[PDB]
Amino acid sequence: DQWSMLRHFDHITKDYHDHIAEISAKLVAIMDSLFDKLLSKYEVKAPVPSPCFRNICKQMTKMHEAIFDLLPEEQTQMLFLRINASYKLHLKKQLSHLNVINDGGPQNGLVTADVAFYTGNLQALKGLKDLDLNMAEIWE
Ligand SMILES: [Mg+2]
16 A cells, blocks of 8 residues: 555665765765865966866866756755865865955955855856855855
C-alpha cells in the first residue's frame, strides 16, 4: 500500500540530505583552496574586474553549471553561502595584509568595484538572486 511504499522511500532516502552536505564539503574545500591561491596574490588596481576576480567568478559560474542538475535549489543556495563565506575570509585576510581600509579613497573604491562584479556575477546565477551575501563583513 501507499503507506508501506513510502516507509521504504523514507528508509532509502533517510540520509540523502546529510550525505549531499558531505559531498558538498569536498566542493567547498576545493573552492577554498582556489580562493586562498588567488586572493593571496591579489593586488588592488584597475581595470575592474581584476584578473583575480575574473578567474574567481568564472570558476563560480562553472561550478554552478556543473551542479545545477545534481542538487536541489535549497542545497545549491546553501552551497553558495558556504563558498561565499570562504571567499570573504580570504578576501578579508588579503585586504588586511595590504592595509586597505574602508575610507572611501581610491583603493577602497577599487575593491568596492571588484566586489560589485563578484556580487553581480553570483546573484545573476539561477536560484541565487536573493542570497544575503553580507559583503560589508570584509571590512570588519
Ligand atoms: Mg587610497
